[PDB]
Write an enzyme that holds these catalytic residues in place. Structure first.
Site, PDB file in Angstrom:
ATOM      1  CG  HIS A   7      -1.834   1.074   1.418  1.00 38.68           C
ATOM      2  ND1 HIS A   7      -3.202   0.907   1.476  1.00 38.68           N
ATOM      3  CD2 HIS A   7      -1.609   2.388   1.657  1.00 38.68           C
ATOM      4  CE1 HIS A   7      -3.780   2.076   1.696  1.00 38.68           C
ATOM      5  NE2 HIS A   7      -2.834   2.988   1.815  1.00 38.68           N
ATOM      6  CD  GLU A   8       0.972   4.089   3.588  1.00 40.58           C
ATOM      7  OE1 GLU A   8       1.392   5.001   2.821  1.00 40.58           O
ATOM      8  OE2 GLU A   8      -0.056   4.224   4.317  1.00 40.58           O
ATOM      9  CG  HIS A  12       0.250   5.919  -0.999  1.00 39.37           C
ATOM     10  ND1 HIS A  12      -0.767   6.079  -1.920  1.00 39.37           N
ATOM     11  CD2 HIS A  12      -0.345   5.651   0.192  1.00 39.37           C
ATOM     12  CE1 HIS A  12      -1.927   5.870  -1.322  1.00 39.37           C
ATOM     13  NE2 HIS A  12      -1.702   5.627  -0.035  1.00 39.37           N
ATOM     14  CD  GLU A  61      -5.068   6.984  -0.145  1.00 40.24           C
ATOM     15  OE1 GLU A  61      -4.521   5.847  -0.053  1.00 40.24           O
ATOM     16  OE2 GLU A  61      -4.631   7.974   0.512  1.00 40.24           O
TER      17      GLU A  61
END
Length: 332
Positions: A141-142, A146, A177
């Protein structure tokens, strides 16, 4: 983010708990309030509320409680050592060893936050509640979403605000997101989108409830007072007098993005979408001719694109977001 964290959170939490959950927190914030952002996220959507509830009830029907779901699918709570070890293995697998500072935090209202401290990328990880089988996903995710999208974006003509206007970009969210949330659960055996769903649900209720009403309402889905506290504060970030109804609706972005991306997954080129930077799935065709793709990085977990696509199908089934449901939702 720091701006939306109440500066008196602890004091108000103690008041709440010591009142046996009957007191309505009176939060305060670092002046000035970010008016624009509060206004932008002052309204809850109900568009996917049934999908959220569908997700939550699917978990509860298989596992009975969140508590059991978490332990059975999450695994053990990790030590700092175990966190650092898994993170290091991740950075290497992702070809980005040495780029991001990693920090362990107790102040976080989530599992993790990617930032720019001292003009430099920083991954802050919440030590409380980091879990064996779940932590890898936070990294997908991070870092895998991102961070990679951010670096790819910096190479593009739309790297700043003026560039976005000049090239006619839609907002990055909810694609950003959405993609990150799918990626979190990508290689889990039971990829329920619990957090995205409960966030969505909490905000929807927060718009019509006081803190006290919301905290009580959530008891139906999660027992733990500490967890419920966190979800309530997130849904009411920016609210001073929480005795009144109101929400900060930002965290609805997760489910919103999930549904749209899954709905359109057949026509989305996921490597290209990541390579183009902070862009909407809807702008891929528009931006493709203008993208600078030579040195853009795609996450390790997208190299096997057929497997990636299979995982998306697994995520869909697991969460009762079948093709026909998505199609009726978004007749696009």
């Amino acid at each position: 983010l720091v701006a939306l964290r109440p500066t008196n959170m602890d004091r108000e939490r103690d008041k709440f708990f010591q009142s046996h959950y009957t007191y309505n927190p009176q939060f305060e914030y670092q002046e000035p309030m970010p008016t624009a952002v509060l206004e932008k996220y002052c309204e809850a959507s109900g568009q996917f509320i049934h999908q959220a509830v569908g997700i939550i009830e699917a978990v509860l029907e298989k596992f009975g409680t969140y508590e059991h779901f978490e332990a059975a699918t999450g695994g053990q709570l990790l030590t700092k050592c175990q966190i650092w070890s898994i993170v290091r293995k991740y950075m290497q697998k992702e070809g980005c060893a040495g780029e991001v500072v990693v920090q362990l935090s107790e102040d976080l209202l989530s599992q993790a936050v990617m930032m720019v401290e001292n003009s430099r990328p920083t991954l802050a990880i919440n030590l409380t509640g980091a879990r064996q089988y779940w932590l890898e996903g936070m990294l997908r995710h991070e870092i895998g979403t991102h961070y990679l999208r951010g670096v790819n974006n910096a190479r593009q003509p739309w790297h700043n605000a003026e560039g976005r206007l000049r090239y006619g970009l839609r907002p990055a969210n909810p694609t950003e997101e959405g993609l990150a949330s799918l990626h979190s659960v990508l290689f889990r055996k039971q990829p329920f989108l619990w957090r995205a769903a409960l966030l969505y649900y909490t905000i929807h209720r927060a718009a019509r409830m006081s803190f006290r009403q919301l905290f009580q309402d959530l008891e139906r889905y999660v027992q733990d007072a500490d967890v419920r506290w966190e979800y309530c504060v997130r849904a009411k970030r920016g609210q001073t007098d929480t005795s009144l109804p109101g929400c900060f609706s930002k965290d609805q972005v997760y489910l919103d993005g999930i549904v749209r991306i899954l709905r359109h997954r057949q026509t989305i080129d996921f490597p290209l979408l990541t390579s183009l930077g902070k862009v909407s799935y809807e702008d891929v065709d528009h931006l493709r001719p203008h993208g600078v793709l030579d040195n853009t990085r795609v996450p390790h977990f997208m190299q096997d694109l057929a497997r990636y696509r299979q995982q998306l199908e697994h995520i869909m089934a697991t969460n009762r977001l079948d093709e026909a449901e998505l199609g009726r939702l978004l007749p696009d």
